[PDB]
Amino acid sequence: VAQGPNGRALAESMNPDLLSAIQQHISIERYASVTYLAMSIWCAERELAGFYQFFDGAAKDEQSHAVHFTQYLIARSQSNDLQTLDAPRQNWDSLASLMATAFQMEADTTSSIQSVYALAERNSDTRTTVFLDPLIEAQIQSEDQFAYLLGRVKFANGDPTALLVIDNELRAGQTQRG
Amino acid sequence: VAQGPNGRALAESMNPDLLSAIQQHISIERYASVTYLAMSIWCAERELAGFYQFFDGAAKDEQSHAVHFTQYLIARSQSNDLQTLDAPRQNWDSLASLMATAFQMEADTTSSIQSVYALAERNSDTRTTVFLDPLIEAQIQSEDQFAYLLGRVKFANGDPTALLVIDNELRAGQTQRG
Amino acid sequence: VAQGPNGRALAESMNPDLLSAIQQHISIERYASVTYLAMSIWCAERELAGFYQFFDGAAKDEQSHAVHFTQYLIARSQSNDLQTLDAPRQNWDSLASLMATAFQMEADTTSSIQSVYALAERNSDTRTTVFLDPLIEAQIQSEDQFAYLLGRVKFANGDPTALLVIDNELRAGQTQRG
Amino acid sequence: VAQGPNGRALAESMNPDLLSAIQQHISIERYASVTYLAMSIWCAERELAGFYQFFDGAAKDEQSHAVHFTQYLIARSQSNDLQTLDAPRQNWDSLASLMATAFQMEADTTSSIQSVYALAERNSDTRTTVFLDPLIEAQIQSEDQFAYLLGRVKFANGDPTALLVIDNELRAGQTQRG
Ligand SMILES: [Cl-]
Ligand SMILES: [Cl-]
Ligand SMILES: [Cl-]
Ligand SMILES: [Cl-]
């Protein structure tokens, strides 16, 4: 029985390029987390308490997703490499513009998973593609969700009354099409 | 004891014109079903989740109504004839215009039942007029309901805030005057 | 942030050939639905109440599967295109022959999903292959199930007593090997 | 305030031909009752306990239907006229032949109601047509039911095993398509 790079018993070696891609994706999701935290604060600063609560929970969820990836590296007996975290964006001209960044950030998160996925397929790492499958499924749901929130906010067309109504929807947990 | 056209024991023969009218009405209700499905999708595409949920349920209900008619033909020992289903309308310029088509589609469904009803009266088919009576009663309730939804959406006069409020009413199941 | 063909925010563009394949598959499943409805009626016409109940539920389930696909197109910000629905087959010489068509229809449904699946792999659309994975798993279960029902009916070898026994099994919900 | 023929206050006079038709129909349903009793006995004599139980209950139900008609005459302040009851048929060569008579007897019961119904329409007696409407609805259900039982027994094609299976279905209360 051989030892993996993190010292645990090694079930199967992992391509170093694939390892680097996973460690980088963990950074993407940690960055999405602090980005949602920044968005939470921006919303709280404008008394959009429902949006604040939503993004506060989104920040904690994204962090969980990131930690889920660190557990997989442990499971594969690979080293983690927790990297420097950039500062998030913190300024937006409007809720609509913030929601656009939020959607793009979710779509970008999926793109990063897809990049890892293609690398695992190139290396025939079926453990990794199986590991990623439900995470892609969750990304589809999050993309559907953020397109719903973005589109609903754009439908409001900057009217505060409509934004207050949507804000209260979010505070109540009404956050997707259902 | 004689056998009906579908092979079951025959309680009383049915005029072939009346049979054709019922088979055609089953198509009307199947078409209303796929029409409400199309309307559900149009609403979902614009993040009108309450309207989406309402029309998704309306599609399943209309299909039930159609199957209820197939059961009556079985009960009368008559053959069913499930026909080609046209594609539904799928494009509207506005929610108000969609709701207008929905109301017209409900009124048209009633007209088709009324046409069957008059044919049964001409043929003195009291089983059929009795069978249709509660379905006409349901149509009155659906017409009242769709006139309420249409009129409420027209009252909104295209304002997104008002449409979001109505959307949330539908998501909560507040779908008629009560 | 770009807009998809159905107007929603677009997480990633979809190949038009893949879109057409999904819209066509939705038709396959809608057609399987009305086919099971026709089979329900054929069974009811011959007092095979258990088979009637089974196929009535199978029709509603297939329709749900179809709507599940329309939701995915919405989630991907792609247009739906609900198409003309052919009339189903409605005549069989025997229950055994009906069950043969039912099994073939289920196997054909899987073939259509597999065709979509290969197209998504060619286009590296991992959202779609992930989306299809549990639907293929369900198809395996349905194929196993319909092979069980078909084989059990063939074992009866046209004996009415055996068919009545199986009919009662279906009415009780005993519809697979367990 | 005028008095009706049975001495009660009279809401509206009833055509004597319509009165006679109702009194005659009450005889039809009393005769259907004793006929189902005879069928119950025939089945019990051949150890077909499920069919015996079914027809014993059918006899009591038909009697209830008859009494429901006497209550309507009372409600209309019309005299009842309980008539001589013929002896029922009591001999059949087979269960299939008995079930054929049972179905015909149910269809004949509906024909008699339809005859009353047409007479009330000729006389514009809307109380009577309204009174008869749910009874016609019940007749549709009974015709559907007896066509199911007859067809299932004919499917058995005289095989005792199949008849024992159906017999047990009836004893369990499985008496229609459901
Ligand atoms: Cl805004
Ligand atoms: Cl509008
Ligand atoms: Cl067979
Ligand atoms: Cl027999």
Describe the structure.
The structure is cut from a larger assembly and holds 4 copies of chain A (178 residues). Chain A is an all-alpha fold. Chain A has one domain (1-178). Helix content of chain A is 72%, strand content 0%. The termini of chain A are far apart. Chains in contact: A-B, A-C, B-C, B-D, C-D. The interface between A and C is medium-sized, with 22 and 16 residues. Residues 94-96, 153, 158 of chain B line the site of one chloride ion. One chloride ion binds at residues 94-96, 153, 158 of chain B. Chains A, B, C, D: Fe(3+) 3 binds at residue 133. Chains A, B, C, D: This is Ferritin. Chains A, B, C, D: Keywords: Metal-binding.
Give a topology summary.
This is part of a larger assembly, with four copies of chain A (178 residues).
Chain A: H1 16-45, H2 49-75, H3 95-122, H4 126-156, H5 160-171
The complex binds chloride ion (CL) (4 copies).
The site of one chloride ion has 5 residues of chain B, from α3.
Q: Gyration radius of chain A, to the nearest Å?
A: 18 Å
Number of helices of chain A: 5
Name the assembly state. part of a larger assembly
The biggest chain-chain interface is:
B-C, 28 and 28 residues
PDB class: metal binding protein
Keywords: Ferritin, Iron Storage, metal binding protein
Entry title: Metal free structure of SynFtn variant E62A
Chains A, B, C, D: Ferritin
Essential attributes:
part of a larger assembly; 4 chains; 178 residues; mainly alpha; 5 helices; binds chloride ion; Ferritin (chains A, B, C, D); metal-binding (chains A, B, C, D); metal binding protein; Ferritin; Iron Storage
